[PDB]
Design a protein around this ligand. Structure first.
Ligand SMILES: NCCCN(CCCNc1ccccn1)C[C@H]1O[C@@H](n2cnc3c(N)ncnc32)[C@H](O)[C@@H]1O
Ligand SMILES: NCCCN(CCCNc1ccccn1)C[C@H]1O[C@@H](n2cnc3c(N)ncnc32)[C@H](O)[C@@H]1O
Lengths: 342, 342
C-alpha cells in the first residue's frame, strides 16, 4: 500500500502499538484545548454535518465521530489501524450509535469504503505539525471525498521565529561537553566530542517558553488541506526573511502551528502558539550549534527544508544568515529524536 | 542466528537504535555506582586480567574494555551490535590501544572471534535483572570461554519482597476512573473503565521507594553465570515463601538485583537494592489485582514465573496466597511496557 511503501515496518509497529493504549488516548482526550476546540468546530458548524456522510481518519477512541454524530451526521466511517478500533466499537455500542458510526479496522490507505463522503475529519497533527506523517494519510483519504467536500481541519499554518535563550543553549552544550573529558575514569573521550555535540544539537527541543525570547515576528507557511496532495509533504521548503526587532544572539528557530476549521457557519482555530494556552504539542525549538549575532533592523534570511523519512518523521535542514554581515549557520535535525524538556 | 530466532526484527531495530545514541551511553556511564563498581572489580582483580585474553560482550562506548586494558590485558575483543561500534573504534584509536583492543561490529551470536578467551566481561543486566534478554547473549558467549575461564559478573541475585503502598494501588483506579464518566463532552466512556484498569495493572512500576514499605525479608533467586545455559533463562520460576515481618495489606511484590564479580583477589558487589544509592535500574514493583491481608508471622507463598518473549522481555505471572487464611491473588504483567513513575 501507499502506507507500507513509505514506512519501515519497525516504525509502524511501534507507532500503532503506542496508540493502542487506553492511557495514551486518555492523555490526548484530557488535553482540553484540543478536545474542546474540535467539539466547538464541529458543533458550531452543524450544517456541515447534518445528514452528511463522514470519514474519521484515525479515530482512536472515536471521540470525533461522536461529535459528528452529535452534529447530526447520517453516517460516519471511523477508520483506525491500531487495536484501539476494538475499544471504539465498544463505545459505539454502549452509546447506542451503531446506526450512525461504523468502525472500519485498518489503514486508511488499505481499507475499502462503500461510498464517497461529504466531509473528512481527523487529528493528524504532530509536533511541528508534520511529525508522524499522518497528514499524508489525511490527504490520501481525499480519494473518498466527493467533489466540493470539506476537510476538518481545512488548513494548517506553521509559524517560525528566531529566538534567544542562552540557558537552553548552555544546557545542551553542557551535556555534550561530557565528551570533552581527557580522563573519564582514566579514558580520553575527547575524540568523540564533535560527534556528541552534533547528536545533541540534532534534537529538537519540545517545551514551552515566554514570548519575550522571540526576536522577530513569525513567518507563516500555510498548507491548504483541500488542495494539497500527499506527495506535496515529502519535501517541504519554507523560505524565511525575518526583520529583527531586538539585537542579540539568535540561538535558533522556534516553531508552532495553528489549524483552522473553515465551516459554513464559522471558522474555528486551534492554535499551539506560545501566546495561547498550552497543549500537549507544546512548541518546538531547533537550536543552532553556533548562535548568530544580529542587530535590530538586520534581516535574517534562509530556508527550512523538511525531507520526509521512512520512520514517520522528517530530516530537518535549517540554513540561516544575517544578510548585513554574511554570518551563516547550517543545521541538520532529526525530528524522530526530540528532547522533551518540559 | 540464535539471536534472530529469539527476537522479532522490529524489537531488535528499536533496541539497537536506542543504544546507538551517545546520550544513552553517557547516561549509563554517569551512573557512578555502575561505572565505579565495574572499574573497581576489574582493577582490584588485576591478576584476572594481566596478560589475559578478554571478551567484552556489548561494549557500547568501550569503557569496560578500557578498564581491562588498565588492568593489563594482552588482547580484548570488544563486540557491539549497534552503530556505537564505530564510536568505540574512534576511542580505541585516540587512546592508542589499537594493539590491544579489537572492536568487532555485530551481534555476539553472529560474529567470529579468532581465539578462545580467559575472561568475559559485560553489563547485560536490565530492569529486574532479566529485561532486554541480554543475559542470554552473555551466556551464549561462553562458547568462546576457555575451560575454567571466568565471567565478570560471575553471579546475579534477583530479590523479591512483598510491599504495602496504598497510594500506588489507589492511583491505578484514580487514573482508570477517567473512563467512568457518562458524559465526557457528551460521550459515555464508562464501558472502557475495566479495560483501562486491566491495562494499568499489567504495567510493572519502575521507581524507587522507602524501605519501610517492605513487609518481609527478600527471597533471593541466584543465577550462576559460570554454570548457567542460555536456555535456563527462557522460563524462570521463582518460588517464594515470605515470613511476614509486619501486619498489613500486601499490594504486590518489589524486585531488585545484585551482581557479584568473583575474582581471584576479591569479590566485589554491585547492588540495586532500595537500601543502596540509586541507579538507573531503580527498582521494580508488580501490583496484585487484589491486595492480601497478612499478619506478622504469617507466610505468603507463591510463584513468580517469567516467560521470555520475542520482544526481548518477559511475560510475568505472579500468584500468591496467605497460607494461614487461604486468601489468594495473581497478576500477569508485561515487562516490555513498564510505567516509569520516577
Ligand atoms: N496527533 C495524534 C493523533 C492521535 N490519534 C487521533 C485520535 C482521535 N482522538 C482525538 C482527537 C482530538 C482530541 C482527543 N482525541 C491518531 C490515531 O490515528 C491513527 N492512525 C494514524 N495513521 C493512520 C492510518 N494511515 N490509518 C488509520 N489510522 C491511522 C492512530 O493510530 C491514532 O489512533
Ligand atoms: N543496561 C545494559 C546495557 C549496556 N550495554 C553497553 C554498556 C557497556 N558497559 C557499561 C558499564 C558501565 C557504564 C557504561 N557502560 C549494552 C550494549 O550491548 C549491546 N548489545 C546488546 N546485545 C548485544 C548482542 N546480542 N550483540 C552485540 N552487542 C549487544 C548494546 O547495543 C549496547 O550498546
Amino acid at each position: 500500500s501507499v502506507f507500507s511503501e513509505r514506512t519501515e515496518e519497525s516504525s509502524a509497529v511501534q507507532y500503532f502499538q503506542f496508540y493502542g493504549y487506553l492511557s495514551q488516548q486518555q492523555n490526548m482526550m484530557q488535553d482540553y484545548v484540543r478536545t474542546g476546540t474540535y467539539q466547538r468546530a464541529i458543533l458550531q458548524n452543524h450544517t456541515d454535518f447534518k445528514d452528511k456522510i463522514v470519514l474519521d481518519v484515525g479515530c482512536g477512541s472515536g471521540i470525533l465521530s461522536f461529535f459528528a454524530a452529535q452534529a447530526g451526521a447520517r453516517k460516519i466511517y471511523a477508520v483506525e489501524a491500531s487495536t484501539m478500533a476494538q475499544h471504539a466499537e465498544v463505545l459505539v455500542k454502549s452509546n447506542n450509535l451503531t446506526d450512525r458510526i461504523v468502525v472500519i479496522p485498518g489503514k486508511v490507505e488499505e481499507v475499502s469504503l462503500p461510498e464517497q463522503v461529504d466531509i473528512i475529519i481527523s487529528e493528524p497533527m504532530g509536533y511541528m505539525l508534520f511529525n508522524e506523517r499522518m497528514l499524508e494519510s489525511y490527504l490520501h483519504a481525499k480519494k473518498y471525498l466527493k467533489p466540493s467536500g470539506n476537510m476538518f481541519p481545512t488548513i494548517g499554518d506553521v509559524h517560525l521565529a528566531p529566538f534567544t535563550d542562552e540557558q537552553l543553549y548552555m544546557e545542551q552544550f553542557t551535556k555534550a561537553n561530557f565528551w570533552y573529558q581527557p580522563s573519564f575514569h582514566g579514558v580520553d573521550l575527547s575524540a568523540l566530542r564533535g560527534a556528541a555535540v552534533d547528536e545533541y544539537f540534532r534534537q529538537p527541543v519540545v517545551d514551552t517558553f515566554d514570548i519575550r525570547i522571540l526576536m522577530a515576528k513569525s513567518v507563516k507557511y500555510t498548507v491548504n488541506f483541500l488542495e494539497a496532495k500527499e506527495g506535496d509533504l515529502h519535501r517541504i521548503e519554507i523560505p524565511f526573511k525575518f526583520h529583527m526587532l531586538h539585537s542579540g544572539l539568535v540561538h535558533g528557530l522556534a516553531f508552532w502551528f495553528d489549524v483552522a476549521f473553515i465551516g459554513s457557519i464559522m471558522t474555528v482555530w486551534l492554535s499551539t502558539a506560545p501566546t495561547e494556552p498550552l497543549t500537549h504539542w507544546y512548541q518546538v525549538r531547533c537550536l543552532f550549534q553556533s548562535p548568530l549575532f544580529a542587530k535590530a533592523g538586520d534581516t535574517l534570511s534562509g530556508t527550512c527544508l523538511l525531507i520526509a523519512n521512512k520512520r514517520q518523521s522528517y530530516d530537518i535542514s535549517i540554513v540561516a544568515q544575517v544578510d548585513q554581515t554574511g554570518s551563516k549557520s547550517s543545521n541538520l535535525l532529526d525530528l524522530k529524536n526530540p528532547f522533551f524538556r518540559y
